[PDB]
Structure 1
Amino acid sequence: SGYTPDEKLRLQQLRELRRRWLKDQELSPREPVLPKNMVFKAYRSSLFAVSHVLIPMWFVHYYVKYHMATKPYTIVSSKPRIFPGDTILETGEVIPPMRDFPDQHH
Structure 2
Amino acid sequence: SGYTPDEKLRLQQLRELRRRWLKDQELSPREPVLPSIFAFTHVLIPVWIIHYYLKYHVTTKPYTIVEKKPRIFPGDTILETGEVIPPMKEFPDQ
Which of 68, 72, 76 is equivalent to 1:82? 72
Q: Secondary structure at the match of 1:69?
A: helix
Q: Secondary structure at the match of 2:69?
A: coil
- 1:21-58 deviation digits (Å, cap 9, x = unpaired): 11111122201112xxxxxxxxxxx2111022211111
Higher relative contact order, structure no. (Cα contacts within 8 Å, ≥ 6 residues apart): 2
- Structure with the greater alpha carbon radius of gyration: 2
**Offset of residue 81 of structure 1:** 0.8
Distance 2:75 2:46 in 1: 41
Partner of 1:17: 17
**Unpaired runs of 5+ in structure 1?**
35-45
Task: Tell me the amino acid that sits aligned with residue 91 of structure 1.
Answer: T
- 1:55-78 deviation digits (Å, cap 9, x = unpaired): 111111111112212211211111
1:101 aligns with 2:87: no
* Aligned-CA RMSD value: 1.4
Distance 1:103 1:6 in 2: 104
Give me the TM-score of the superposition, normalised by structure 2.
0.86
Distance 1:50 1:63 in 2: 19
**Unpaired runs of 5+ in structure 2?**
none
Q: Tell me which stretches of 4 or more aligned residues in structure 1 moved more than 2 Å.
A: none
Q: Secondary structure at the match of 2:66?
A: strand
Which of 37, 47, 51 is equivalent to 1:57? 47
Percent of matched pairs sharing the same residue: 78
Task: Tell me the amino acid that sits aligned with residue 30 of structure 2.
Answer: P
Matched residues, number: 93
Give me the TM-score of the superposition, normalised by structure 1.
0.78
